[PDB]
């Protein structure tokens, strides 16, 4: 950096925090001074679909305490498929995050009135990514929270999922732009296994792009961003 001690120090600092398999990106800052952000644990670029669900108006963000996590591969539109599962969670007390391909229609709508009343505490946020990348990434989340991806593709109905298939977390933070899972159950051995597998997916990455996204995901699942 042409003898800029501050750049050196900031890089050094970043490298130290995100680890060896962590990503570091540079972008325009707001003010005059350089600034380093380190995102802890896993977080993807996803805002709540229902803004009328913010349970902390101070930050303008959703903060679900020790919740269940529903991973839906297919997009949701009907409250129907939820009822069997939505029910098991309601009679369990714990809140529920839902990361589907999408949530719209009267499904999204009714979910609002279900928390607006105090029947269940339930969040809805789009799936991270697009196309064949999404399902790959949605699985990452399953691993970190010990849940099963309900994939309509591989002969599975959303309706026939039980508490069994749900992921779990210590806490969840969702605002208008990003969702963050804080410390998921995550079978320790199954994390680093799914990491050492994606780690080798970069090894045989036949370009630069199928190299980038991969080591991004590893950072979300291993160190930091």
């Amino acid at each position: 950096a042409n003898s800029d001690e501050t750049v050196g120090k900031l890089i050094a600092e970043a490298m130290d925090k995100v680890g060896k398999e962590g990503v570091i990106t540079v972008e325009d800052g707001t003010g005059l001074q350089d600034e380093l952000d380190v995102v802890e644990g896993m977080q993807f670029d996803r805002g709540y679909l229902s803004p009328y669900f913010i349970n902390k108006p101070e930050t303008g963000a959703v903060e679900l305490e020790s919740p269940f996590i529903l991973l839906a591969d297919k997009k949701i539109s009907n409250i129907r498929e939820m009822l069997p599962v939505l029910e098991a969670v309601a009679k369990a007390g714990k809140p529920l995050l839902i990361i589907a391909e999408d949530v719209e229609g009267e499904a999204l709508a009714t979910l609002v009135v279900n928390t607006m009343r105090g029947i269940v505490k339930v969040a809805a946020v789009k799936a991270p990514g697009f196309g064949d990348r999404r399902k790959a990434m949605l699985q990452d989340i399953a691993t970190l929270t010990g849940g099963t991806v309900i994939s309509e593709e591989i002969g599975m109905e959303l309706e026939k999922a039980t508490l069994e298939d749900l992921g779990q977390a210590k806490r969840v933070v969702i605002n208008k732009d990003t969702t963050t899972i804080i410390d998921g159950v995550g079978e320790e051995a199954a994390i680093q296994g799914r990491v050492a597998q994606i780690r080798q997916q970069i090894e045989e990455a036949t370009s630069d792009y199928d190299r980038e996204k991969l080591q991004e995901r590893v950072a979300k699942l291993a160190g930091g961003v």
Partner: protein
């Protein structure tokens, strides 16, 4: 004033549009649907078909009934209350017990 249905026709009143209870505790918010249950308010003498005799209807005044809400059914306003006029042919069952 009340109504007197004309033989074979039955006068009923509708019930709760997706009562928020189904699935258990979940307050299933209205999914853009209706209800098929209803209370029988008035009864006509009975179908006159086939000339010979006039057969009574198998639903009495005050029954709770599941019906098929199709074309046969009509909507009317009595004393400013929502009421339905269909024939027994459209009534499918009675909820008892």
């Amino acid at each position: 004033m009340n109504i007197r249905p004309l033989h074979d026709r039955v006068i009923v009143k509708r019930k709760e549009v997706e009562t928020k209870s189904a699935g258990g505790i979940v307050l299933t918010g209205s999914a853009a649907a209706k209800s098929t249950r209803g209370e029988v308010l008035a009864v006509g003498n009975g179908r006159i078909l086939e000339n010979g005799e006039v057969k009574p209807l198998d639903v009495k005044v005050g029954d709770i009934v599941i019906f098929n809400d199709g074309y046969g059914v009509k909507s009317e306003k009595i004393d400013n209350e929502e009421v339905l006029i269909m024939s027994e042919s459209d009534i499918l069952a009675i909820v008892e017990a």
